[PDB]
Design a protein around this ligand. Structure first.
Ligand SMILES: COc1cc(OC)c(-c2ccc(C#CCO)s2)cc1C(=O)NS(=O)(=O)[C@@H]1CCC[C@@H](OC)C1
Ligand SMILES: Nc1ncnc2c1ncn2[C@@H]1O[C@H](CSCC[C@H](N)C(=O)O)[C@@H](O)[C@H]1O
Ligand SMILES: [Mg+2]
Ligand SMILES: [Zn+2]
Ligand SMILES: [Zn+2]
Length: 849
């Protein structure tokens, strides 16, 4: 009567240390603990999970196997991974963690992750000595392995007998250390009749343990579930070793949680029609899921869908063949780590989007209102807002997709746009929904068109060009940003600050939205009517579609939110640049002592002082900044700005990767300032002329070019050629990239015109999307059209196009000097031939220097 589990145990115990270390992780799932372990070593108390346990519990919670609610009790909490995870879930009101502690036992790790204020972890509490307490969720992860399965059987039954009296029509998730021993099976079968639930295997569990979890939400055959795991674990001994599937670890946020402040109160008069139409369109599967996870977004209903997305990105085989040394580079592989499945979407939504920003103080709201009014008057001094048109939108769609091109050519699409526009003119919206059938697609593209019609002027007419806005960089181009930062560096004063905001779009408040909409005051009446509908009905009352996995299949949830920026809405870039200019001017006023703590708290703050500063210094202060959406560089009049955090945090623009009240750190060397994911180097050309060039860690450049878009080798090769040409024009100064670009261009047929874009950045002008000789394009961009290049003498050779210094190239990720890189360089004509052979007997040219 020997079980398959007992057979697995005998085989496991016979493994040598070498084969046991390989087997334990073969084909498992594992979170990358690198960042958290280093953060915990540095004493950081925000974002990080204290152990692998938070991700372990997330696996069950995201599958609805256990849905913590009310008073949660965590038995054997150890460091607290399960408890800290629970603190941020919708229905959880209190988390009580109990753990033994003492020598050889894990102790609770104090943290300040989101909801720490409802987490009560107690050491010195051996749960086997504790009387059961009333709770709504019972969690238990206790069970120490033993080479003897009978010692494990005794430990398992001891846990099962300890936990059972805590169970009373509540949620639960209990580790069953050894579920294969017949006496454990018998006991679980009796427990399942009294308390329900089922046994599940968590794929984050190592193969060296047969642990399973008894979870409350589900049913099934315990014997079948146990034996299926035994078979899997047995097959894994002989299976060719598979490296573990790596997943991103959890981000548990920061700060106190006020459960009563989380719920969203929707404006049903405004959003009711949109919900009604989605319901009618998907009426056959429309349902109202009470188990939805949304804390701060209003939930309206769901319909059934097939799952969209992938765990990882597709790989460009042509670029991979010509970049062999980078196959072992972690940052290069980490680039291709993007989970867009309903699982990945829900994790991002919980961690980043499902938050609420406190309302700023009345004095802060007063300063923002004064500043916004002044800024809009400044921005509209020369230009007038204007309506964009069908003809203009059609032109943008055509010149940038295949379905969008078909749609804009369809008279039915524009008939639908007209019908919706007529509702907007009446102060009603019926079909404008965004995402986190052609009718669904026509309604979506139609929504984007109406937004473009009303607010497209901000981008189409370059309202944020440096000439129009002083701080802006819209239309400038990556090749000009470095020269702009060098120009800012000449302004006397403090260091150059470049603080990033954590999730800027989620930090856009109702006050920000009301300040942004003031641009309608400058519009013609018919335009004001259309923009007012966009701001009020759609930007300040967003209806969103988001996928969610469930035990029975995937669903599309319909949710809503009044504040935050609609990241998937047109106008985002311009409105973010506007609000960020305003926010940074307010921070400069605080740095200068114009705006004080007393002023921010004042409910009847006087405007005189603020207007005087804006009218006398405002433009000078805008010229000290480079602002692109949520990204900024600010060079204030002195360094008091580093310590000026009251208004910035009060406006909701909390800085990323730094404690709330820690002063910022700036740079005096403009070449080290980060901006738009780049930094910029000043180089001296062989002919003595200076050039300012853009740069980023080389692994990001290679990692990105190794990611395919959109069977078919031609499209893969052409996208490879597009990255190669972008490298020759923008990143020619990186040794590895100029060599790899020459290799790719030698490997791809000369007449094949680059297809598909390398980037969607607003800073990209795509001068590399051509068959024209790259040196004549280089001369055009860098010499002829370059306003910071006085001597217009062309360069006749790539030998006169400069590289970074060797040490600088290496600091920025070059592999120059490594043996693998020398081997790669030697192997280039061979790698080129390999790609050429895979493509076939086409016409190729040799670009190798
Ligand atoms: C913020 O990221 C970028 C910023 C850029 O410039 C500021 C660029 C550019 C590359 C080449 C450029 C040029 C030029 C001259 O016209 S501009 C490229 C990227 C870039 O990574 N583009 S991307 O691969 O499509 C990336 C994926 C994830 C973040 C996204 O944010 C825009 C875009
Ligand atoms: N008798 C007992 N009473 C309380 N805690 C106990 C115990 N026996 C073992 N433990 C604790 O139970 C824990 C199980 S592992 C805890 C991991 C946790 N779920 C997390 O996510 O961080 C260990 O830390 C161990 O010290
Ligand atoms: Mg920045
Ligand atoms: Zn609408
Ligand atoms: Zn660099």
């Amino acid at each position: 009567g020997e079980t398959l589990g007992e057979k697995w145990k005998k085989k496991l115990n016979q493994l040598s240390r070498k084969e046991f270390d390989l087997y334990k992780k073969s084909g498992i799932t594992e979170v990358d603990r690198t960042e958290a372990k280093e953060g915990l070593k540095r004493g950081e108390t925000t974002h990080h999970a204290v152990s692998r346990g938070s991700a372990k519990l997330q696996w069950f919670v995201e599958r609805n196997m256990v849905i913590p609610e009310g008073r949660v009790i965590d038995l054997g909490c150890g460091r607290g991974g399960w408890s800290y995870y629970c603190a941020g879930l919708k229905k959880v009101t209190e988390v009580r963690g109990y753990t033994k502690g003492g020598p050889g036992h894990e102790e609770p790790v104090p943290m300040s992750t989101y909801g720490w204020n409802i987490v009560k972890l107690m050491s010195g509490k051996d749960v086997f000595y504790l009387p059961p307490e009333k709770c709504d969720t019972l969690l238990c992860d206790i069970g120490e392995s033993s080479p003897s399965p009978t010692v494990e059987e005794s430990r398992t039954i001891r846990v099962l007998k300890m936990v059972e009296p805590w169970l009373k029509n509540n949620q639960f998730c209990i580790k069953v250390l050894n579920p294969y021993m017949p006496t454990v099976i018998e006991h679980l079968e009796r427990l399942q009749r009294k308390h329900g639930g089922m046994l599940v295997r968590n794929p984050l569990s190592r193969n060296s343990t047969h642990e399973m979890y008894w979870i409350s939400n589900g049913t099934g055959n315990i014997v079948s579930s146990v034996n299926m795991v035994s078979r899997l674990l047995l097959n894994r001994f002989t299976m060719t070793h598979r490296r573990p599937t790596i997943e991103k670890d959890v981000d548990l946020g920061a700060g106190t949680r006020h459960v009563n402040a989380e719920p969203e109160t929707p404006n049903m008069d405004v959003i009711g029609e949109r919900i009604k139409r989605i319901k009618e369109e998907h009426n056959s599967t429309w349902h109202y899921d009470d188990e939805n996870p949304y804390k701060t977004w209003a939930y309206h209903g769901s319909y059934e869908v097939k799952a969209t997305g992938s765990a990882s990105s597709m790989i460009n085989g042509v670029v991979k063949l010509l970049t062999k040394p980078w196959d072992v580079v972690p940052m290069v592989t980490q680039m291709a780590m993007t989970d867009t499945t309903p699982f990945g979407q829900q994790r991002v939504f919980k961690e980043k989007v499902d938050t609420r920003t406190p309302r700023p103080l009345p004095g802060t709201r007063k300063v923002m209102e004064i500043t916004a009014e002044w800024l809009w008057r400044t921005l509209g001094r020369n230009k007038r807002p204007r309506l964009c048109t069908r003809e203009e939108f059609t032109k943008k769609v055509r010149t940038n997709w295949d379905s969008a091109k078909a749609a804009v050519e369809d008279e039915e699409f524009w008939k639908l746009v007209d019908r919706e526009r007529e509702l907007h003119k009446l102060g009603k919206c019926g079909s404008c929904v965004y995402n986190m059938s052609r009718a669904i697609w026509y309604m979506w593209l139609g929504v984007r068109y109406l937004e473009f019609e009303a607010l497209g002027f901000l981008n189409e007419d370059h309202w944020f060009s440096r000439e129009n806005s002083y701080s802006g960089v819209e239309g400038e181009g990556l090749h000009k940003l470095g020269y702009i930062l060098r120009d800012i560096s000449k302004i006397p004063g403090g260091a150059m600050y470049a603080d990033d905001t954590a999730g800027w779009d989620t930090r856009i408040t109702e006050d920000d939205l009301h300040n942004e909409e003031k641009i309608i005051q400058q519009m013609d009446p018919e335009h004001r009517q259309l923009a007012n509908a966009i701001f009020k009905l759609t930007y300040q009352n967003k209806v969103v579609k988001v996928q969610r996995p469930t035990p029975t299949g995937t669903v599309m949830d319909i949710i809503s939110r009044k504040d935050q920026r609609g990241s998937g809405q047109v106008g985002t870039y311009g409105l973010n640049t506007f609000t960020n200019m305003e926010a940074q001017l307010v921070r400069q006023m605080e740095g200068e002592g114009v705006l004080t703590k007393a002023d921010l708290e004042n409910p009847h703050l006087l405007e005189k002082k603020i207007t005087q500063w804006l009218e006398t210094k405002g433009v000078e202060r805008l010229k000290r900044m480079a602002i692109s959406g949520d990204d900024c560089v600010v060079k204030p009049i002195d360094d008091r700005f580093a310590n000026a955090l009251l208004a910035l945090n009060d406006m909701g623009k909390v800085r990323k990767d730094i404690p709330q009240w820690q002063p910022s750190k700036g740079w005096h060397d403009w070449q080290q300032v980060p901006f738009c994911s780049h930094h910029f180097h000043e180089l001296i050309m062989k002919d003595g002329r200076k050039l300012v060039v853009p740069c980023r860690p080389q692994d990001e450049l290679i990692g990105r070019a190794r990611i395919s878009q959109g069977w078919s080798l031609r499209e893969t090769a052409c996208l490879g050629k597009a990255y190669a040409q972008m490298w020759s024009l923008m990143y020619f100064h990186r040794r590895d990239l100029r060599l790899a670009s020459n290799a790719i261009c030698s490997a791809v047929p000369v007449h094949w015109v680059p297809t598909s874009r390398t980037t969607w950045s607003i800073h990209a002008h795509h001068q590399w999307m051509t068959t024209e000789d790259m040196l004549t394009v280089w001369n055009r961009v860098w010499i002829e059209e370059n306003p910071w290049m006085e001597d217009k003498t062309p360069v006749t050779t790539w030998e006169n196009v400069p590289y970074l210094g060797k040490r600088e190239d290496q600091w920025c990720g070059s592999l120059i000097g490594l043996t693998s890189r020398a081997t790669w360089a030697q192997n280039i004509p061979t790698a080129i031939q390999q790609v050429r052979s895979l493509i076939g007997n086409e016409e190729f040219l040799d670009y190798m220097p």
